[PDB]
């Protein structure tokens, strides 16, 4: 149960982010839905609101400090605090050979799947440390069990993000702040995993990556 | 015997990359010494030529396409081909709390190391695939879990992914994980025909 | 909450097994405490009973099919069913160099940390499959993070047990039966991990090994 | 060049172990062919001696101390020493539901493979430690997650643990993971001085 708790969910307009926002709001948390797409973010918030929830939509490029700080400040100021930060990876776009991935796609993966976690760390972790509680859950991009070709550059930055998440966790391990990760492997099970990890029943877990059925 | 083979060594002017440049030259291989410091690259090249080897030094920001393509085009045009690419792109890093890490400090570890493997793949592996043979060796020099420990995991992961994407192509892609002689030995082994049964493998060795 | 649920906990008289038995009984489960030591098993059951619980002690060599079948039958007949099976690894005994480990210690590790999981599979899994629900949690022996010398033969059979647990899980994955594992790495966090994995809130997890602070 | 070196190859009468026995003999190394079938071991030994090599065949249940100690004592007494031990002890296994696996079927995978590495360590590594040099190579032949997939993980894990427990001893402990030429090549490499910078390493190669 996450009553009186505030969550930011990035990637919130679609995919795993929308399912995660739905689940956390169903558990009683106030949700700031953050997404590149302001309209998609607002639609998800309207849906959560129509269903009994308290939610707000906000546009945000998780690669930009200012966008990520503004979403943290918006959650604190207008929803009244921040206790949970869920960073959603993208939809992995299409599967194609390593040498067909253009620079723009490579760059986007870096921005959305690694740089976002760095800014999340810089923008949300001090608040958590200050209040002596908080949870960050990083949802990796979806890679197959024993993955084959087609996701080489995704699997690369994914391995980096999971290790950064475990590294951040060791630093914050005696702060009350828990930093954990979800590895969707080919939406209910992804959302259930995030909702459990955000709950106080997961208080004994940090620096963990939970493999779940994508 | 890397005689009759051309090798590009990134980060070649010092550290693991200098030691690799020397071992590979000593094995009889032409070597394009690539590094961020043109002066140091030229220095290593002159030493190698002075030791009886063949070598050209070029300034190269591995995070930039033009720089990597230059190093590749030069090796094919001036050194006479390309059969080996060694990617050394890590640096030392004082472990400080992650909230003291500036964006640049972060990009230098995650953005440079990853994109260097990216440009290495876009720029050099088509030449390997065209001739049906070639070896990429990615030394994870980035320097227990720290904020920067993810570069090494990605380098290893990318090595294994690229290797699968080049299965049965005659193109082998391998890694070295230094935890410098033993590093240069593992590179020279992996770059040699004696390692033709090995692709997608990471060799942990004492640094 | 594990009300109206029956758990077998092996290794139950001491160590992580006792902490796990305490936690599961505190959550409402009936506990058959199984242990090599009949008296230690009975003492733990008496403690759980004095605290509000329903518990029974029973001697059992988890390396022997007959001992393991008798504990399953005892739980079904006298506590009224079986839904949870926790296999506790040993205390890792002492840390000593690989070549100082005698054959008797090597043999004991195999029996307690691997053969037990095979019999648990043969003796408890058909019952779970029959009823279409059930959870098995295998608690590995405690190994350090990035472990050094001293636990070579433990770390060997531990790696085997965790892979067997993931293998068993894939087989039973569409049966309602969840097979999961806990890796104590140097007792509350071990017991919390087992209690969560045994609950219906972990229903979306199978074939997972949870690293936790030992 | 394994000339001037003695090697014990377990499971030597067929499969990966025969191919290893031949490659190592061809490298100039005396070879004690150890296997569960004495006749087949003697056959391989005769073939190797007939090819100009030196070899003795012995029946050996690797799960038993006396059998492994015999193979070790014989190699030191009849073949003139011991510098290499290759552990092949896996077998093929039809994947069936785990509830159809009999206790014996389970012991044959988990008990034999693990205890074989145990006796290999108790029986052979003291000789290596005494002379300050030696190489143990553990080929994980036990044959995606299955009930028997844990043998391979243990073999790799034990290899890395033993290697750490023998750091700086001149005694190297390595593994090969066949997913037979490429297996025998990786064994012969790992057993040779060319691999002296490698301990605690598992080489994945196509089987």
DSSP B41-56: HHHHHHHHHHTT--EE
Tell which residues of chain A come right before a gap with C–N over 2.5 A.
186
Q: How far apart, in Å, are the Cα atoms of D82 and each of C34, D123, D163?
A: 47, 11, 18
If DSSP codes are grouped into helix, strand and coil, which group holds residue C40? helix
CA atoms D191, D193, D194, D199: torsion sign: positive
Give the residue from C213, D145, C74, B179 showing the smallest Cα distance to A208. Answer: C213
Contact A212 C193 (CB under 8 A): no
- Which residues are CB-contacts of D148 (< 8 A; sequence separation ≥ 6)? C167, D93, D109, D110, D142
Which residues of A line the annotated binding site? 8-35, 61, 141, 158
The burial class, CB within 10 Å (0-12 / 13-18 / 19+), for D105 is middle
Write out chain B residues lying below 8 Å of D197, CB-based.
181-182, 185-186, 205-206
Nearest CA among D168, D186, D164 for reference residue D177: D186
SS3 A166: helix
Query: Is residue B37 within 8 Å of residue B59, measured between CB atoms?
Result: yes
Q: What is the resolution of this structure in A?
A: 2.2
Binding residue numbers of C for NAD(+): 8-35, 61, 158
**Residue B191: helix, strand or coil by DSSP?**
coil
- Burial state string for D36-65 with b = 16 or more CB within 10 A and e = fewer than 16: bbeebbbbbbebbeeeebbbbbbbbbbbee
| Burial (Cβ within 10 Å: 0-12, 13-18, ≥19) of residue A183 | buried
Task: Decide if D72 contacts D82 (C-beta within 8 A).
Answer: yes
Task: Give the integer Cα–Cα distance in Å for D9 and D56.
Answer: 11
| Interchain contact, C213 vs A192, CB within 8 Å | no
- The dihedral sign for the CA sequence A201, C212, C135, C75: negative
C183 φ, ψ to 5°? -120, 95
Residue C161: half-sphere exposure toward Cβ, Cα within 13 Å = 33
CA dihedral (B75, B79, B83, B89) in degrees, to 10, reads -50
- Residue ranges of chain D whose CB lies within 8 Å of a chain C CB: 65, 97-99, 101, 103, 106, 110-111, 114-115, 117-118, 121-122, 125-126, 145-154, 156-158, 161-162, 164-165
Chains linked to D by 3 or more Cβ pairs within 8 Å: B, C
CA distance D91 to chain C (A): 16
CA distance D133 to chain C (A): 17
Within 13 A of B73's CA, how many CA atoms are on the CB side? 7
Give the other-Cβ count within 10 Å of B120's Cβ. 25
Q: Helix (H, G, I), strand (E, B), or coil: what is residue C31?
A: strand
Neighbours of B167 (CB within 10 A): 14
Within a 10 A sphere around the Cβ of B49, how many other Cβ atoms? 15
**C54 vs C12, C13, C20, C49, C50, CA distance in Å?**
15, 16, 15, 6, 9
Distance CA A25, CA A66 (A): 26
Sheet holding D6-9, edge to edge: D55-59, D30-35, D6-9, D84-88, D134-139, D171-178, D202-205
Is D147 in Cβ contact with C167 (below 8 Å)?
A: yes
- B136, B144, B157, B167, best to mutate vs chain A, most A CBs in 10 Å: B157
C159: nearest CA partner in chain D: D154
Angstrom distance (rounded) from CA A157 to CA B110: 9
Q: Per the CB < 8 Å rule, is A157 touching B156?
A: no
* Ramachandran class of D11: left when φ > 0, alpha when ψ lies in -120 to 50, beta otherwise: left
Q: How far is C8 from chain A (nearest CA, A)?
A: 23
The torsion angle over the Cα atoms of residues B95, B101, B102 and B104, rounded to 10 degrees, is 50
Record: contact D205-B197, CB cut-off 8 A = yes
* Closest chain A residue by Cα to residue B144: A167
| Minimal Cβ distance to B154: which of A98, A121, A156 | A156
Cα end-to-end span (Å), chain D: 24
Considering only alpha carbons, which residue of chain C is nearest residue D161?
C152
Query: Would you give the DSSP letter of residue B193?
Result: G
Tokens linked to C109: 């590790």
The two structure tokens encoding residue D119: 């006796």
Cβ contact, residue pair B145, A167, below 8 Å: yes
Among the partner residues B101, B106, B154, nearest to A159 by beta-carbon distance: B154
Please, are residues C117 and C138 in contact by the beta-carbon 8 Å criterion? yes
Q: Is C120 exposed, middle or buried (0-12, 13-18, 19+ CB in 10 A)?
A: buried
Burial class (CB in 10 A: 0-12, 13-18, 19+), B102: exposed
Q: How many angstroms separate the CA atoms of B42 and C174, rounded? A: 63
Q: What residues of C are in the A interface, CB distance below 8 Å?
A: 188-189, 192-193, 196, 201-202, 204-205, 207-208, 210-213
Residues at the binding site of A for substrate are 141
Burial of residue A182 (number of CB atoms within 10 Å: 0-12, 13-18, 19+):
buried
- Contact yes or no for C159 and D165 at CB 8 A: no
Gap between the Cα atoms of A126 and B66, Å rounded: 40
CB A134 within 8 Å of CB A177: yes
Nearest CA in chain B to D168: B206
Q: How far apart are CA C182 and CA C197, in angstroms?
A: 9
State the residue for tokens 């990597």. B68
Chains near C with 3+ CB pairs less than 8 A apart are A, D
Whether residue D185 is annotated as binding a ligand: the answer is no
Per-residue CA distances from B63 to A110, B135, D178 (Å): 13, 20, 36
From residue D68, alpha-carbon distances to D72, D87, D109 in Å are: 6, 11, 18
DSSP per-residue codes, A96-162: --GGG--HHHHHHHHIIIIIHHHHHHHHHHHHHHHHT-EEEEEEPPP--SS--TT-HHHHHHHHHHH
- Which residue has tokens 């109206």? C4
Residue C165 CA, distance from chain mean position: 12
CA separation, residue C26 to residues A102, C29, C138, C176 (Å): 56, 7, 20, 24
DSSP B200: S
Element spanning A14, H or E: none
CA distances to A211, C24, D177 from C85, rounded to whole Å, are 22, 11, 33
Q: Using an 8 Å Cβ cutoff, are B35 and B17 in contact?
A: yes
DSSP assignment of C111-158, as one string? IIIIIHHHHHHHHHHHHHHHHT-EEEEEEPPP--SS--TT-HHHHHHH
Task: Report the alpha-carbon distance of residue B85 to residue B166 in Å, rounded.
Answer: 15
Q: Are the CB atoms for A138 and A184 separated by under 8 Å? A: no
CB D138 within 8 A of CB D162: no
Choosing among A180, A205, A209, A211, which should be mutated to test the C contact, i.e. which has the most C CBs within 10 A? A205
- Candidates A165, A190, A204: best to mutate against C (most CBs of C within 10 A) is A204
Is A99 exposed, middle or buried, given 0-12, 13-18 or 19+ CB atoms closer than 10 A? middle
Q: Which residue has the tokens 């050394």?
A: B88
Task: Name the H helices within D35-148.
Answer: 38-50, 65-74, 103-106, 112-131
The rounded distance, in Å, linking the Cα atoms of C179 and C160 is 15
Three-state SS string over D149-196 comes to HHHHHHHHHHHHHHHHHCCCCCEEEEEEEECCHHHHHHHHHHCCHHHC
Helices (H), D35-110: 38-50, 65-74, 103-106
Compare CB distances from B121 to A65, A99, A155 and report the shortest one's residue: A99
CA C213 to chain centre: 17
Whether D204 and B201 lie within 8 Å, measured CB to CB: yes
Which residue has tokens 């599961």?
Answer: C24
| Nearest chain D alpha carbon to C157 | D154
Taking the CB of residue C132, how many other CB atoms lie within 10 A of it? Answer: 9
- Overall residue count recorded for chain C in this entry: 214
Task: Find the discontinuities in chain C where C to next N exceeds 2.5 angstroms and give the residue preceding each.
Answer: 186
C-alpha angle C75/C78/C82, rounded to 5°?
A: 30
> What b/e string do you get for C88-110 counting C-beta neighbours within 10 Å, with b at 16 or more?
bbbebeeeeebeebeeeebeebb
Measured CA to CA, the distance from residue D20 to residue D192 in angstroms comes to 13
- With 0-12 / 13-18 / 19 or more C-beta atoms within 10 angstroms meaning exposed / middle / buried, residue C26 is middle
- CA pair distance C81, A152, nearest whole angstrom: 48
Q: Report how far residue C27's alpha carbon sits from residue A68's, in angstroms, rounded to the nearest whole number.
A: 41
3-class DSSP state for residue D27?
A: coil
- Name, in order, each residue with C-beta under 8 angstroms of B94's C-beta and a sequence gap of 6 or more: none
CA distance C37 to C19: 16
Q: What is the CA radius of gyration of chain A?
A: 16
Contact A156 B157 (CB under 8 A): yes
D203: chain B residues, CB-CB within 8 Å? 198, 201
Site from C204, C208, C210, C211 to mutate, A interface, most A CB atoms within 10 angstroms: C204
Q: Domains in chain C, ordered, with CATH?
A: 6-213 (3.40.50.720)
Minimum-distance CB partner of A204 among C192, C201, C204: C192
Number of CB atoms found within 10 A of residue B61's CB? 16
Q: How many helices (H) and strands (E) does chain D have?
A: 7, 7
H runs (alpha helix) in A15-86: 15-26, 38-50, 65-74
Q: List the end-to-end C-alpha distance of chain A, in Å, as a whole number.
A: 23
A201-to-A42, A198, C72, C158 alpha-carbon distances in Å: 30, 8, 30, 27
Tokens of C72: 């399953």
Nearest CA-CA distance, residue C161 and chain D, Å: 7
On whether the CB atoms of residues D152 and D142 are closer than 8 A, the answer is yes
Q: Are A47 and A23 within 8 A, CB to CB?
A: no
Number of C/D CB contacts below 8 angstroms equals 97
């Amino acid at each position: 149960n996450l009553n009186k708790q505030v969550a930011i969910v990035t990637g919130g307009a679609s995919g795993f982010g929308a399912a995660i926002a739905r689940r956390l709001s169903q558990a009683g948390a106030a949700v700031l839905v953050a997404d590149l797409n302001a309209e998609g973010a607002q639609r998800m918030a309207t849906e959560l609101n129509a269903a009994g929830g308290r939610a707000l939509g906000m546009a945000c490029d998780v690669s930009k400090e200012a966008d990520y700080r503004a979403v943290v400040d918006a959650a604190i100021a207008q929803l009244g605090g921040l206790h949970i930060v869920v960073n959603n990876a993208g939809t992995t776009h299409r599967n194609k050979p390593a040498l067909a991935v253009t620079e723009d796609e490579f760059d986007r993966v870096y921005r959305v799947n690694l740089k976002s976690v760095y800014w999340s760390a810089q923008c949300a972790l001090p608040h958590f440390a200050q209040q002596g509680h908080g949870v960050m859950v990083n949802v990796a991009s979806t890679t197959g069990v024993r993955p084959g070709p087609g996701l080489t550059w995704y699997s690369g930055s994914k391995a980096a993000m999971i290790n950064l998440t475990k590294g951040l966790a060791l630093e914050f391990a005696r702060s009350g702040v828990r930093i954990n990760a979800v590895n969707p492997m080919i939406p209910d099970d992804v959302a259930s995993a995030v909702a459990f990890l955000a709950s106080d029943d997961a208080s004994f877990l940090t620096g963990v990556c939970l493999d779940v059925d994508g």
